[PDB]
Amino acid sequence: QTIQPGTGYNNGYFYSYWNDGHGGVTYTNGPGGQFSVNWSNSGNFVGGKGWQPGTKNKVINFSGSYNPNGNSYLSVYGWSRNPLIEYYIVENFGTYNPSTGATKLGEVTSDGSVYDIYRTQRVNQPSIIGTATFYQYWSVRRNHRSSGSVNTANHFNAWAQQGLTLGTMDYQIVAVEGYFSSGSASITVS
């Protein structure tokens, strides 16, 4: 019932599950848009369900439970190509706000909360095209939650307004990410 890292389709949804090989993570696809993650003294991992490709105006619905113990995120997460960008619309997190130390590039209101916007840079890091230097875009929700709706156009438009351009979309998922933590989560996407 559980899987090792990979990508594919499961009950009509794209999934991606990646880990750094440290151990301590269990990823399980469920019926429809559902997936779960249970982790205990993990390394870095990212898993969840959605679409390949994403779109720039999707309304993404999610529902469930998210119980990190340590550094983890719950986000709409994905990539663009040309330019290569890794992006996040962060609905909830654990012990670390991923924007800590990052330069704030604005605010956007969407789906019941203000979000703060940031750009960061990854230097010679793994990516969907190989080792690369690339930007990351962040919207960080002020009011944390583990169910709701995300109107991705509000974010992508706000990012563009601020000079944060997206290329052609690659995948787009609701993802549970961890970085050397423990936790459990069970999320249904639509």
Is-catalytic flag, 177?
yes
Per annotation, catalytic residue among 25, 64, 86, 92: 86
Per annotation, catalytic residue among 91, 116, 170, 177: 177
Question: Would you call 151 helix, strand, or coil by DSSP?
Answer: strand
Q: 142 among the known binding-site residues? A: no
Structural determination approach: X-ray
The set of residues, in sequence order, having a beta carbon less than 8 Å from that of 157 and lying 6+ positions away, is none
Q: 77 among the known binding-site residues? A: yes
Is-catalytic flag, 107?
no
Q: How far is Cα 105 from Cα 86, in angstroms, rounded to an integer?
A: 16
At 90, which CATH number? Answer: 2.60.120.180
Please give the structure tokens belonging to residue 102: 């990052």
Q: How far is Cα 80 from Cα 134, in angstroms, rounded to an integer?
A: 11
CA gyration radius, the chain: 15
Instruction: Give one word for 163, left, alpha or beta, with left for phi > 0 and alpha for psi -120 to 50.
Output: left
Please give the structure tokens belonging to residue 15: 């999934």
Question: How many residues belong to the chain?
Answer: 190
Query: Count of CB atoms within 10 A of residue 77's CB?
Result: 24
Q: How far is Cα 175 from Cα 28, in angstroms, rounded to an integer?
A: 13
Query: Count of CB atoms within 10 A of residue 110's CB?
Result: 20
Kindly report the backbone phi and psi dihedral angles of residue 159, in degrees, each rounded to the nearest multiple of 5, phi listed first.
Answer: -55, -50
Closest CA to 77 of 149, 159, 136, 10: 136
Q: Which strands form 72-81's sheet, in the order they lie side by side?
A: 6-10, 13-19, 44-51, 168-179, 72-81, 85-93, 132-141, 113-125, 103-110
Contact 108, 83 (CB under 8 A): no
Q: 27 among the known binding-site residues? A: no
H or E stretch including 39? strand 34-39
- For residue 188, list its beta bridge partners: 34, 63
This PDB structure is determined at a resolution in Å of 1.1
Its domain, for residue 10, covers: 2-190
Contact 140, 90 (CB under 8 A): yes
Closest CA to 150 of 32, 62, 74: 62
User: Count of domains in the chain?
Assistant: 1
Residue 9 has what DSSP assignment? E
Residue 107 CA neighbour count, 13 Å, CB half: 4
Q: 88 among the known binding-site residues? A: yes
Closest CA to 174 of 2, 30, 25: 30
Q: How far is Cα 37 from Cα 26, in angstroms, rounded to an integer?
A: 6
Instruction: Report DSSP letters for 48-97, one per residue.
Output: EEEESS--SS-EEEEEEEEEEESSEEEEEEEEEETTTEEEEEEEEESS--
Question: Would you call 146 helix, strand, or coil by DSSP?
Answer: coil
Q: 171 among the known binding-site residues? A: yes
Q: How far is Cα 56 from Cα 139, in angstroms, rounded to an integer?
A: 15
Q: How far is Cα 155 from Cα 20, in angstroms, rounded to an integer?
A: 29
